[PDB]
Structure 1
Amino acid sequence: LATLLGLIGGFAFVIMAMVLGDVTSILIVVGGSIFVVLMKFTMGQFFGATKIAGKAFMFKADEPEDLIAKIVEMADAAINNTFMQKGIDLLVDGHDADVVRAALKKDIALTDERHTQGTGVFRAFGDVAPAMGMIGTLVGLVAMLSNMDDPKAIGPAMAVALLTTLYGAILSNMVFFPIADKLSLRRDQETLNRRLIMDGVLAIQDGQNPRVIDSYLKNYLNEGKRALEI
């Protein structure tokens, strides 16, 4: 049934996209939304949020099970993952446990803040899109009423103005808000992965027993949204 749900969701997104595309009506909505958003976020912050969203949509997060397998491999011994490699280098160069904990917690908080900022930017976009669609619709109505010449053109031109409103909704509920929700999900996934990596690195550095730390990692896997999958 997973394939059926994926196909129906993709088909709904596709039909909404062809309803979206037409060029000017979306342009008004996006221009107004961008203008209002840039009063709260700088241009650099907006591009950072767009980069975070692109990374979260194109690339996939590392599975926690493979992370556990690698962690136990290194624990029994004594990596493509960037955070894992950084932690390994920090612990192998020679440092106290407190320094490693501080560095890893700082990186975790940095990633959490970046994903929260991206979520905030896209939620602001979702909040402000329908208002701008409505403003464009009202401007179109004013133009249509001040250029009222043919009854046969009352219908179609009206439908053009209302089109702007539609786009706002189609952008608010199906583009920006889903992107923010996906960013929140990616934040949760990356926080779980980095917390697992930090715990494993501390266990390896502190020479803890592999069995108890493995059980600890399973306990970490058996919480959050992941509870529904067990």
Structure 2
Amino acid sequence: LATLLGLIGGFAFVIMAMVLGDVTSILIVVGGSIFVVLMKFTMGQFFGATKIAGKAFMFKADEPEDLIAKIVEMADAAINNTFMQKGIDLLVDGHDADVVRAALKKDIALTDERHTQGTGVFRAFGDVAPAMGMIGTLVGLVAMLSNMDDPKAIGPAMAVALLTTLYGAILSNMVFFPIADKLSLRRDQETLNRRLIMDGVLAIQDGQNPRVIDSYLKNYLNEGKRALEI
């Protein structure tokens, strides 16, 4: 049944896209949204949020299962991941446990703040888009009423102006709000993964028994939105 739901979602997005695809109407909405948003976020912060959304959309996060396998193998012994590699190098170079904890928690908080800022930017875009669509529709109504020439043209011309509103709605519930939700999901996934890395690195440096750390990390795995999967 998974294929059916995936295909129906893809078809809904495709039909909404061809409804979107028509050029100046979306331009008004996006220009107004960008102008309103830039009063709260700089250009650099907006571009950072766009990079965040990209990295979250085209780069799948690391599964906790393979992370668990890697920490287990390296704890019994004594890589593609970047946080894991940096923590590994940090303890190998020789450092106290407390400074390693501070560095790992600082990186965790930095990533969480970055993802929260991206979520805020995209949520602000979501709240702003329908209002600018409405404004564009009202301006189009003003223009059509001022250029009232042909009665048979009353229908289609109005349909153009209202089009702007539609675009806002389509951009509000299916582009920006979904991106913010995906950003929150990716932030939760990264927080869980980085907490697993922190616990595993601390256990390895302290030299705890692998069985108890595996039990604790499975307990970590069995919470959150993943609780439905079991």
Distance 1:11 1:192 in 2: 32
Per-residue deviation, 1:79: 1.3
Listed as ranges, the gaps of 5+ residues in structure 1 are none
Distance 1:110 1:147 in 2: 54
Per-residue deviation, 1:205: 0.1
Per-residue deviation, 1:7: 0.4
Cα-to-partner distance string for 1:139-197 (whole Å, 9 max, x where unaligned): 00000000000000000000000000000000000000000000000000000000000
Distance 1:229 1:65 in 2: 14
Q: Please report the TM-score for the alignment, with normalisation by the length of structure 2.
A: 1.00
Cα-to-partner distance string for 1:11-60 (whole Å, 9 max, x where unaligned): 00000000001000000000000000000000000000000000000010
Cα-to-partner distance string for 1:62-98 (whole Å, 9 max, x where unaligned): 0000000000011000011000000000000000000
Distance 2:70 2:175 in 1: 36
How high is the sequence identity, in percent, across the aligned residues? 100
Per-residue deviation, 1:6: 0.6
Distance 1:73 1:87 in 2: 16
> Is 2:200 aligned against 1:210?
no
Distance 1:118 1:2 in 2: 30
Q: Secondary structure at the match of 1:41?
A: coil
Listed as ranges, the gaps of 5+ residues in structure 2 are none
Q: What is the aligned partner in structure 1 of residue 37 from structure 2?
A: 37
Per-residue deviation, 1:136: 0.1
Q: What is the aligned partner in structure 2 of residue 161 from structure 1?
A: 161
Q: Please report the TM-score for the alignment, with normalisation by the length of structure 1.
A: 1.00
Q: Secondary structure at the match of 1:131?
A: helix
Task: Give the number of aligned pairs.
Answer: 230
Distance 1:111 1:67 in 2: 18
> Is 2:53 aligned against 1:53?
yes
Per-residue deviation, 1:219: 0.1
